Structures are given as C-alpha cells and as structure tokens.
C-alpha cells in the first residue's frame, strides 16, 4: 500500500540504521524450512514426491546471472540423499563471507538497511480495510530486522526435470489469492536515481538480476523505490516481469543495440547446468 502523497512527502530511508538488526547467515541459509515443507507434503501424499532438486532461490538466481554477471565467487554444497538432490552454501564459505562482511564498510550496511526500511514503508501487517490510523502512521517507528519474513515454496520444471524450490515473498499486492497466489505477489527493491548513461547501465544490470529473481519464482510485477544518495525516496516505478525483456530490447535510448538477447542465453545456460547436476551425481555423493 503506497499512495502518491507519501512519495511527495520525501520519506527518509536512513532513519533507524542505528537500531538495525542482522541475523545469522549460516542459520538463515539452512534448508530446514523447505525440509519441513517436504516432510509435510510427503505426510499427506504418503510417498516421495517426483521433485529432484531442492534448494533456495538465491543460488539459482546466481546461476542464471553467471554467464553475464560473474563479479562474485561462491562455493556450494551438494548432497544427493534418497535419490533427490539438495543444494546449500558452504559453511566454511559462509564464515569467509561473514569475515568479508566484517571487513565491509558502513556503506553496504546503510544500503541494506535502507532497502529493508523501504520494504517496511510500502507494506502493511493487515489488509488495508481492516487497518487503523495507528498502524498506518506508526510504520516509521517500528524497528526493522532481517529475521522475521514470509517465504513461499514453488514447484517448477525445466526440460524434463521437476524442480521444487523456495523463496521469500516481500508482500502481496492487494490480498491473498488462494486460487493463484503467484499472480498477486509483489517484489520490492531499492535503487539510486538515474542521471547518466552509467546509471542506465547499472540499472539495467539490476533489472536483469531482479528479473532472474522473480521469473524464477514467477512473480509477475516488480516495483522499485528510487532513492537519492541521501537515502530519501524520490519516485516509484512499476514493471511487469514479462515486459522486462521487451523493454530492454525495445529501449528507444539504447545507444548500444544488443545483437543478441541475453535472457534466452541465460535460460539455456541454466538448463545445461540443471542437466549437468542431474547427470554428474548418481546417489549418496557429496560434491562442491
């Protein structure tokens, strides 16, 4: 829920950073909730599901972004238990990343806090009709964190392999659609304002990453809150996940035409990676 008046009110995003919270990366990266969901669904089914790969959305997003966004390195752990695959991060690599975060400056902390704050602003604990003024106005005072969140588990499939992954959901557009929840899901991320060509390039890279994010989960709509360098929200723009490849391709200001579409190449690479993972390991093996 976000009318234009708040956008015109110049909401700050840096307020509350000194009360910011950060959870345990190793604890959060565990596949435990997905395992609980699998245990439940098997309990109703009474038999092992046909799903082959179980993992988090972030790893697959990284895999999609790999052929064209390889600015980071990673180590992933693979366990094939009971004939089904399980992919999670590497705990020593988790410790290394935590050390790097300790070495990281306050810039990243402030930016991630601002992102969580923007998520806080444009969200409501209850649907709009049943809220009250006290809930609406006191949003800026509630302390944010990175522990409590809502996530969803989705079943998909590429080529001939069924895939069962999970991911966090920012919020729903208007309410919960018990018949098609994916239709009403909305994702939120922040970005700096756009003034030069480098701004369009970086924005397009972020669009590619977020498109991978949502399209893997099938989220139709994506919204950014454009904040300035002072962590003050300026404007908000809406996009649909289907229109993103066309918008990038059909950009009237594309001073560098793209002779090749990266979306299809990324999907082909992801399919090849899935085939490689399904074939390389047979049973009861651990790889890296």
């Amino acid at each position: 829920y976000l009318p234009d008046g708040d956008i015109d009110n110049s909401i700050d995003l840096s307020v509350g950073s000194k009360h910011f919270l950060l959870g345990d990366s190793v604890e959060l990266s565990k596949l435990d909730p997905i395992l609980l969901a699998l245990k439940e669904i098997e309990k109703e089914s009474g038999a092992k599901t046909k799903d082959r790969i179980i993992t988090w959305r972030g790893i697959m997003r990284k895999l999609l972004t790999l052929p064209y966004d390889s600015e980071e390195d990673f180590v992933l752990d693979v366990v094939s238990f009971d004939g089904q695959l399980f992919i999670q991060f590497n705990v020593p690599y988790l410790k290394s990343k935590d050390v790097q975060k300790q070495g990281d400056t306050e810039f990243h902390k402030k930016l991630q806090f601002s992102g969580y704050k923007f998520e806080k602003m444009a969200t409501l604990p209850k649907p709009w009709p049943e809220c009250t003024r006290k809930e609406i106005d006191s949003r800026a005072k509630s302390k944010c964190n990175n522990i409590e969140q809502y996530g969803a588990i989705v079943r998909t499939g590429i080529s001939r392999i069924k895939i069962l992954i999970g991911g966090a959901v920012a919020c729903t557009a208007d309410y919960y659609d018990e018949n098609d929840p994916l239709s009403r899901y909305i994702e939120l991320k922040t970005t700096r304002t756009i003034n030069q060509y480098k701004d369009m390039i970086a924005f397009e890279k972020k669009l590619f990453r977020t498109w991978a994010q949502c399209f893997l989960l099938g989220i139709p709509k994506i919204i950014y809150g454009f904040r300035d360098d002072n962590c003050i929200l300026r404007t908000v723009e809406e996009f649909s996940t289907n229109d993103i490849p066309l918008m990038v391709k059909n950009n009237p200001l594309n001073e560098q035409p793209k002779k090749e579409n990266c979306y299809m190449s990324s999907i082909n690479f992801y399919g090849a990676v899935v085939e490689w993972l399904n074939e390389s390991v047979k049973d009861d093996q651990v790889w890296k």
Binding site: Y1, L2, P3, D4, G5, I7, D8, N9, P127, W128, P129, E130, C131, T132, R133, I136, A173, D174, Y175, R192, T193, I194, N195, M200, F203, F226, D228, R234, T235, V236, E237, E238, N251, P252, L253
Partner: protein, 674 residues
C-alpha cells in the same frame, strides 16, 4: 445559492451535457442504442436520488397514473443520457433521523400557512403514504421491464431502496459507497455518477475520497439542458488552493478536503441554524477559508480525522472569528441602509447589532429574560448542544447515522465568541432505532394533512382532548428576525416530546389492518438481476437449489458486494403486472414472467471504521487546470466546452504513479525530446 458561488469561483467544474439527437451512428438517421459509446465518457455506476424526480415542482398531472408514466419516461431519458454500465442504485427517502425531523417539521408547517392564504396533493411524497407503497412496486416493474426488453441491459444491476429502508437519500448512497470500500477486492478505478438537486451533493461527493466521481443535474440558469459537475476537476482546484506553505507536518490533501468540507457546514446545513455572523450569500465560506488557512500553521494537527473532531484545534479556529464579529455586523448595517438611499436618490431594531454590546441585547430579547445567571446558564448550554450537533453531523456524513434520536433544543445559534473551554465538554451518542413510518408521519405532517395519516390516528392529531394537541397548533408565531418577512422566518413550535408521542401512537396499532401494519415495518433493499447476467446461474444454484438461506458476496463482474438472501415473496413462475392502469399516449408495458429475472433480498457488509485516504492502485485522469488556470487561483483574490469528454474524464493512463525526476521511464521522455 452555493451553486452560483461554485460556478463563479470554479468555472471548469461545470460542463454541458451532450444530449446529441436521434442520429448518432455516423449520420443516415440511425436512432441511438443503449450500447452505443457515450460522448459524455464511460460510466460504471449511477446512483439516483428519486426525490428530484418524484417532486419536480414546476407548478400539472392530477392523477397518479398520469405522472408515473411521466416519471418512467423522464428516468428513461436520464439513464439514456448517462448510460451506466455496471450498477444502478435507486434511493427513495426513508425515515430520516430525529435531527432532520425539526427542520422537516418547520417546512411542512409553513406550507400549512401557505394553504390558508391560498384560501384567502404534494404532501403524499413523505414515506408511509399509500402513494409510497404504490410507488415502491412501480419501480420494481420498471426495472424488470428494462432488463428483459433491452439488449444493452444484460450486465447491469438494479438496487432498489424504497421508503421502507430507513435513512435519507444521500445517506443511503453514502453508506453503500463506503461499504464497497470495506471489501479488500474493491476496484479503485470504479467511476461513479449521482443525479440530484441538493447542494450538499458536492460536499458529500468529496467525502467518499473517490476521485472518479461526478454529479449530474439540470441547468438552473438555463429539450431540458443538463450540466455535468466533475468533482475530480474540483479536486485539482482544492489541491492547489488549500496547500499553504510553511508546515510543521507533511501536507495531506485528503485531510485538507475533510477540513474544507467541515467548514462548509458552519456556513449552513440542514440540521443546525447558521451562526448569526455567517451567511453563505455573504461569501462567509471564503471568510472561514481565509481564517482556516491563516491559523493552520500554528496548530500541530488538522481539525478533524475521519470524521472525529479535535476540540482544541476547532476552538482555536473560531477564536479569531470572535475578533471579526464587530466588523461583520457593522458591514451589514452600513450596507443595508446604503442600498436604501441608492433607489431613493435615483429615479432587528430591538438588538441593533451594529452598536456595541449586542451580546446582552441578543440573548435578553430572544429569551424574554435578563437575569445574568440565567443568561450565563443558557449560553453555556447553547455551546455544548451546538458542538454536539457539529459532531453529530460530521459523523453522519462519514460513519453513517450515529444517533437516531438527537435533535437541536434551541431555535438560534450562539455567537462565535461563546465557544470557549470546549475541551471540558463531554460528547456521547446513542444510536437507537429509526422511527416507524407512521410515527414519522405524525411528527412531520401538519394539522391539514390528516387524510394521508391513517384514519385511526386522525383523531389523536386534531382532537381538542388529544394528549398531543399541544403539538398541533393551527396558528403559530413567526419570529421574523430576517430579511423582510418570511425568507428565513423561524416557525416557533414546541419540540415534540418523544415519550408523550411514542406512548400514544403505540396504543393505536392494534386496531389497524395488516396492509397498514406491513406498511409500518422496516425492510431491506432488494436487487434484481438479468437472465443473461453472469451471476444469474450462480445465485439460483445456491439460493434456489442448494437451499442456502443466505449467500455472501465479494467484488464481482457487477462490482456489487454484500449478502444475498432469498426473497420469500418472489415466485419463480409469477408474472409481474404493471400496477398503474395503462393510460393512453404512452408505450404499453406488457406483463413479464419471472423466468427472465431474479429478485433477492440484499444487505451490505458489516460496518467498519472508514479511513479517509485514497485507495491503492488508483489511476488519475488528466488535468484541465493549466498554469494560467493555476495562477488565477493563488493570486486572483476575488473575481467574477466539450473537448476531451471521452478519453479525459475516465482513468487516463495505465500507471498508478507519475513519471518524475530520476524514474527510469521518466528519464526516457525527458531525454526523448533532447
């Protein structure tokens, strides 16, 4: 009165209606059809205030049968004029709250004096008359005929709220419109139009906080012409006008509109007398607006929030109004006389408001006493009741009726200097239940309309030994205190005591007939659906096959939410017969069986505390107001048509937000030209 000022100050919110002619389909004399595109812009919902049609005045058919057909023909025209596509709400006044009884009582008693001088029926419109019972069934037949005999009425509903449903015309509209917002699935871009003549509609239209709203009425200063009244254009005016600079709290036009609507009720309404220093014709609204803008930066909060007052803030508002009484009163007295010598040179006294100390004379004469303690007691009582009235009215336009029995116990308004220490006052309301129509008839009909009243109750109204005969004087004092004679005359009458009135009336219901007893019981609104409509299979399958007593609703193809209840009186095989005898000179209306429509009892969602903020996912239209239009508002001070009526009125564009500053799309357009 207010309409003239609105036209003068805001010119662009009024536009003529393109009634077109018979030929619309690219010439060749093709008669219009309901499915043809509307030159006035597409519309989703239309709400009808049936009073403007049932009482057209224009003093004339003598029998009911003559005018019912005229009503049907007239209503057919206006529906064709606007062409709603989703819903039609038809509202007929029920029993109004006790507060409006006194105002309605004065209007009727004055008409009694009008008849007496005419000696040297227009009173049957009130709810509870046999004419209402005939009219209520008359609407049902008309709705059924139109649905089953028109290809263009396949997906349009009709909701009927006759005199049986408690509440007045606009209040019925207000409650239903708010109930639509209570459902989380409500489409924000639903366009609304409402037809009526009362000047309150402009204010009530802004209470919904639905930008896609408009009001339809005929040209007062004029085939009869009609004038559109676009409120979304008006919102552009108020947003520009009511944005004062230098604020300690963020600007919020949604709360500003509530404040602006609020002050437009001190100037005048239909529940409380206007303040002695205020008059709409004297441009008193601009006086309050200037004062409200001036004082606002000092305060920390707005006057009202979702219909709830902020007593410390409002006490500040009229504090400096007390600083302008003497100038205002002297202005009137100086100008009143000055106009007299104007005609003379060319080819009230008990108070002398212009002279100082008017406060003593005013209360002493108007109350026939001069004890300072008595005046002090009365004056303090005056303020407490008046603030309650303002509190009661403001709730009545935002949260439905908060009290069915409250009324104003005095004939005059206290001076603005009297409202002090309001925060110490305690305000409480009891909702109660609305009166039965027969009780309402006795409370508002004068002594010269016993025929409309049931014959049993006729004795208790005109008997010399009747226990309420004191409530029925043939001749009454006329406290002029006004322009010259009768323009704002106060019909000084005793206020009806409920206990005396209610005890007597309930002792006479036994000897009545079932037709009258049935006519003296509240009901609920009905809804009729077309055979080809999407919900027709759904409702029948559940309310007539599964045996469900009731069935809930949500936002659907029609756009109507609520609760559906099977109508016991409805027969699946019955045939509707036009109750009015078919006269001549009009189209014959054949009887229609129930195989082509369904009638179901209707209800609204449970009441919820409404919030006066714009809904999510809304899309705004374009803007008439250009820079020149804007400039004339800020710096203009005081001062003395069909383009884009198809793609402009509705929700133009597909983006909820606007392309500004650093937005990606906004970057494209600004760098497209360069």
């Amino acid at each position: 009165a207010l309409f003239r000022w609105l036209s003068r100050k805001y010119p662009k919110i009024i536009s003529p209606v393109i009634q077109d002619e018979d030929v619309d389909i690219d010439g060749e004399s093709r008669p219009t059809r309901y499915e043809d595109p509307n030159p006035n812009g597409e519309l989703d919902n239309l709400y009808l205030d049936m009073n403007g049609i049932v009482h057209p005045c224009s003093h004339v058919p003598e029998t009911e049968d003559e005018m019912m057909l005229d009503v049907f023909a007239y209503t057919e025209n206006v529906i064709m004029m606007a062409r709603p596509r989703k819903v039609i709400y038809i509202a007929v006044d029920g029993v109004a709250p006790r507060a409006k009884m006194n105002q309605q009582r004065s209007r009727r008693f004055r008409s009694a004096q009008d008849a007496k001088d005419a000696n040297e029926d227009s009173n049957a419109i009130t709810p509870g008359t046999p004419f209402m019972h005939r009219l209520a069934d008359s609407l049902r037949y008309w709705a059924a005929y139109k649905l089953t005999t028109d290809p263009g009425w396949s997906g349009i509903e009709v909701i009927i709220s006759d005199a049986s449903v408690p509440g007045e015309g606009e209040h019925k509209i207000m409650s239903y419109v708010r109930s639509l917002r209570s459902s989380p699935k409500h489409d924000p871009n639903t366009t609304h139009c409402i037809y009526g003549l009362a000047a309150a509609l402009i204010f009530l239209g802004l209470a919904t906080h639905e930008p896609h709203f408009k009001i339809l009425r005929e040209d007062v200063f004029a085939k009869t012409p009609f004038l559109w009244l676009h409120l979304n254009i008006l919102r552009e005016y108020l947003q520009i006008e009511l944005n004062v600079p230098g604020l300690s709290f963020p600007f919020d036009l949604e709360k500003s509109i509530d404040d602006w609507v609020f002050i437009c009720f001190f100037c005048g309404n239909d529940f409380l007398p206007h303040l002695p220093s205020l008059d709409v014709r004297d441009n008193s609204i601009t006086t309050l607006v200037t004062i409200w803008k001036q004082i606002l930066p000092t305060m920390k909060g707005y006057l009202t929030t979702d219909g709830y007052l902020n007593l410390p803030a409002v006490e500040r508002l009229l504090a400096e109004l007390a600083k302008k009484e003497d100038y205002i009163f002297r202005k009137r007295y100086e100008d009143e006389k000055r106009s007299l010598e104007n005609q003379k040179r060319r080819k009230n006294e008990e108070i002398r408001l212009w002279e100082p100390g008017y406060r003593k004379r005013y209360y002493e004469t108007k109350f026939h006493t001069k004890d300072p303690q008595k005046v002090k007691k009365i004056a303090r009582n005056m303020v407490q009741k008046y603030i309650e009235g303002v509190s009661w009215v403001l709730l009545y336009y935002y949260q439905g009726c908060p009290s069915w029995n409250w009324y104003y116990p005095y004939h005059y308004a206290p001076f603005a200097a009297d409202f002090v220490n309001l925060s110490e006052l305690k305000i409480e309301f009891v909702e109660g239940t609305p009166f039965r129509p027969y009780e309402q008839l006795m409370s508002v009909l004068p002594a010269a309309s016993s025929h409309n009243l049931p014959d049993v109750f006729r004795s208790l109204m005109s008997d010399a030994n009747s226990e309420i005969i004191d409530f029925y004087p043939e001749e009454f004092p006329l406290d002029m205190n006004g322009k010259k004679v009768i323009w704002q005359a106060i019909p000084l009458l005793p206020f009806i005591d409920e206990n005396r009135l209610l005890k007597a009336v309930q002792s006479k219901y036994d000897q009545l007939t079932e037709d009258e007893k049935f006519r003296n019981t509240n009901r609920s609104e009905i809804l009729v659906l077309g055979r080809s409509h999407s919900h027709y299979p759904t409702l029948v399958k559940e309310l007539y096959e599964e045996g469900k007593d009731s069935y809930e609703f949500q936002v659907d193809s029609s756009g109507v939410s609520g609760v559906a209840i099977k109508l016991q009186s409805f027969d699946r095989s019955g045939v509707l017969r036009l109750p009015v005898k078919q006269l001549e000179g009009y189209r014959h209306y054949p009887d229609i069986s129930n195989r082509d429509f369904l009638m179901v009892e209707f209800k609204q969602l449970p009441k919820s505390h409404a919030k006066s903020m714009i809904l999510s996912g809304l899309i705004p239209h374009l803007r008439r107001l250009t820079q020149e239009d804007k400039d004339s508002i800020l710096y203009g001070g005081t001062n003395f048509e069909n383009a884009d009526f198809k793609q402009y009125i509705g929700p133009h564009g597909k983006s909820q937000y606007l392309p500004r500053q650093g937005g990606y799309k906004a970057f494209i357009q600004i760098h497209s030209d360069e």
